[PDB]
């Protein structure tokens, strides 16, 4: 029996790493993974120097990964086991593999960029900043003081400290991710610098927190294996698993950090449907997280798991990994007296770049060249409240346009309309020419497909859905049975506390959607200068 000790930053991030990396890896390999930490560079150096290494795999910042490799603290990685070619070229080396990409972002309980941390008059309250000498604080201070992005390095330290001085009294230092989350989730600070994923975690927990991505500061974490590890072979197998496309995708989906495998689907937002082939069932699976604005000002998450299986016996297109991008608009018909929803949607397939090497693909594709009438019928049961919904309209696959009106035929809808949107015809997505080979949905027509989902609402119940999507004559029909269980009668769903819109889905939540606003933190600079800055930082910290 073999066991590895995995060391990370604790809290929601480490929970996600356990769930997305450790659990799958243990299942597959029979190797136990024990969760330890937090990452502490001192403790790492010390155990390496003493020759009694207790830590097998450690999550570290890129600056430290370079320094530690230079100081001889790390095992050289075994690229017979880790697929080096699949890792973002920027975040792989002889002594490290990329763990994930993230940003420091400005979190608040109105504020637009780092200058807001310095204006206590306009924006009152304490400000949260990272306690440890490390890329981020000095840079954002310089940016707030008018230094342009491209002229940050080398850091003008005197100027940065002078800028921080103007607010020293109002700074609350955070030493760890958990503390930063507590500082913001309670009102102890009003604003600050946070790891983006930590803010994501708070949002999904119903905390009312906002983010600006202006001048977001990009950095990467690296998985390293401390020199002298007693479990070298097992550590390497773990790095292989965690750095694979699947491990990266799953970790990204749980945290809103960005994956670092070139084969990972590069979505802009976790609400976009990530599609993968299910060879065994001759169909596809999908995953995504929808968000809904609550009237109290928070945001409620809806975690979707989807499986689609062809009804017919015919041959179908099994896609390469990609995603769907959806814009939805909810509205009301002023002349409609029943409980109802008017929905307008655009769906486009994306996530494979147009290339020469990537270029009619199925008989079913031909059924969608024109405008096609749609009928949706749903029979639902949520906590024993029965209800029916019927919708009609048209689909235009060429433009990926859906226009639909839905009626609740049984009276008042016992749930909010927004929560039914995703249940209430992906065969209408526009697939670009270079991607038509990846359109499972159209390929299964006209016999159709079965669409099954689990939708979990954070801190509330679950919908379970089973739908048949097929042609009946000229009409594309989506017939659905929905069963909902374990809802709170006074919760956001059964107590109708959700806004009638799709606004929570408008602002993307992954770092990859804000390249234009990114600033690259210079981890090579920090590798070389870190110790000297630390000295200066520690001195300044008690002045």
Residue 236, domain CATH: 3.40.190.10
- Measured CA distances, 423 to 132, 464, 480, 538 (Å): 46, 10, 8, 55
Residue 42 lies in a domain: yes
Classify residue 268 by its DSSP letter.
S
Domain range for 281 is: 273-501
Integer Cα distance of 406 and 422 in angstroms = 13
> What is the residue whose two structure tokens read 């770049």?
353
Cis peptide bond prior to 527, omega within 30° of 0:
no
- Could you tell me if 328 and 407 lie in one domain? yes
- Could you tell me if 369 and 488 lie in one domain? yes
Structural domains of the chain, count: 3
Integer Cα distance of 489 and 301 in angstroms = 18
Please, what is the Cα angle at 159 between 154 and 162, to 5 degrees? 145
Q: How far apart are the first and last CA of the chain?
A: 53
Residue 507 lies in a domain: no
> What is the residue whose two structure tokens read 């009438």?
373
Residue 264 lies in a domain: no
- Could you tell me if 80 and 107 lie in one domain? no
Residue 267 lies in a domain: no
Gyration radius (Cα) of the chain, Å: 25
Integer Cα distance of 278 and 81 in angstroms = 25
What CATH number does the domain containing 427 carry? 2.40.155.10
- Could you tell me if 139 and 210 lie in one domain? yes
- Could you tell me if 215 and 228 lie in one domain? no
Q: 360 near 436, Cβ under 8 Å?
A: yes
- Could you tell me if 349 and 438 lie in one domain? yes
Residue 261 lies in a domain: no
- Could you tell me if 368 and 322 lie in one domain? yes
How many residues are given for the chain?
543
Helix, strand, coil shares, percent, the chain, to 5: 30, 35, 35
> What is the residue whose two structure tokens read 């659990």?
23
Residue 509 lies in a domain: no
- Could you tell me if 68 and 165 lie in one domain? no
Residue 320 lies in a domain: yes
- Could you tell me if 57 and 19 lie in one domain? yes
The sign of the torsion formed by the CA atoms of 266, 434, 321, 503 equals positive
Integer Cα distance of 8 and 307 in angstroms = 33
Residue 331 lies in a domain: yes
- Could you tell me if 249 and 167 lie in one domain? no
Structure tokens belonging to residue 309? 């299986």
SS3 for 413?
coil
SS3 for 1?
coil
- Could you tell me if 364 and 290 lie in one domain? yes
- Could you tell me if 190 and 339 lie in one domain? no
Instruction: Identify the bridge partners of residue 457 per DSSP, sorted by sequence position.
Output: 302
| Main-chain phi, psi angles of 20, to 5 degrees | -90, -25
Integer Cα distance of 139 and 132 in angstroms = 14
């Amino acid at each position: 029996h073999e066991s590895i000790n995995f060391v990370s930053w604790g809290g929601s991030t480490q929970d996600a790493q356990k769930q997305a990396w450790a659990d799958p890896f243990s299942k597959a390999s029979g190797i136990t993974v024990v969760q330890d930490g937090p990452t502490d560079y001192g403790k790492l150096k010390a155990m390496v120097e003493s020759g009694n290494v207790q830590w097998d795999v450690v999550d570290v910042e890129a600056d430290f990964a370079l320094r530690a490799a230079a100081e001889g603290l790390l095992e050289p990685l075994d690229f017979s086991v880790i697929q080096r070619d699949k890792i973002d070229p920027r975040f792989v080396s002889d002594h490290g593999v990329g763990a994930f990409l993230y940003s420091y972002v400005l979190g608040y309980n109105k504020p637009q960029d780092w200058t807001a941390l310095f204006d206590t008059k306009t924006y009152p309250g304490k400000r949260a900043l990272y306690k440890w000498p490390s890329p981020g604080v000095l840079e954002l201070a310089l940016l707030a003081d008018g230094v342009p992005a491209d002229k940050l390095y080398p850091l003008d330290l005197d100027r940065a400290f002078k800028k921080l001085d103007t607010i020293k009294k109002d700074i609350v230092w955070w030493g760890g991710g958990a503390q930063s989350q507590q500082l913001l989730a309670s009102g102890e600070v009003s604003m600050g610098q946070f790891w983006n994923g930590r803010i994501h975690a708070l949002q999904e927990d119903g905390a009312p927190v906002g983010v600006s991505w202006k001048q977001n500061l990009v950095m990467a974490d690296i998985l390293v294996v401390p020199k002298g590890t007693k479990n070298k072979a097992a550590a390497m197998k773990f790095l292989a698993s965690a750095s694979s496309a699947k491990g990266q995708d799953d970790f990204s989906a749980l945290t809103a950090y960005a994956p670092v495998n070139i084969d990972s689907v590069q979505r802009l937002d976790l609400a976009q449907v990530r599609i993968t082939a299910d060879k065994q069932k001759n169909g596809i699976m999908a995953n995504f997280k929808i968000r809904h604005n609550v009237e109290d000002g928070s945001v409620q998450s809806a975690d979707h798991y989807q499986q689609n299986t062809p009804i017919g016996d015919g041959p179908v297109l099994l896609p390469d990994n990609h995603y769907l991008s959806t814009q939805s608009v909810l509205s009301k018909d002023p002349n409609e007296k029943r409980d109802h929803m008017v929905l307008l949607e655009f769906v486009t397939a994306a996530g494979i770049t147009l290339g020469m090497d990537e270029l009619s693909m199925s008989k079913g594709e031909e059924l969608f060249t024109g405008v096609v009438p749609i009928l949706v019928e749903l029979d639902g049961d949520v906590n024993g409240h029965k209800f029916s919904v019927r919708g009609e309209g048209e689909g235009d696959a060429t433009n990926g346009k859906l226009t639909l009106k839905f009626i609740c035929t049984t009276g008042k809808l016992p749930v909010p309309w927004p929560t039914l949107v995703t249940t209430l015809v992906q065969c209408f997505s526009r697939y670009p020419d270079h991607m038509k080979q990846h359109d499972f949905f159209k390929s299964a027509m006209p016999e159709g497909y079965v669409q099954e989902r689990t939708i979990s609402f954070k801190d509330d119940g679950t919908y379970k859905t089973r739908a048949e999507v097929k042609f009946e004559g000229d009409t594309l029909v989506n017939r659905i049975e929905l069963k909902g269980i374990d809802f709170k009668e006074d919760g956001n769903i059964l107590g109708h506390k959700l806004e009638y819109n799709w606004n929570a889905n408008l602002a993307p939540n992954l770092p990859t959607a804000y390249v234009k606003d990114q600033i690259t933190l210079d981890f090579a600079y920090w590798a070389k200068n870190g110790p000297a800055i630390a000295t200066r930082w520690n001195e300044w910290l008690v002045k």
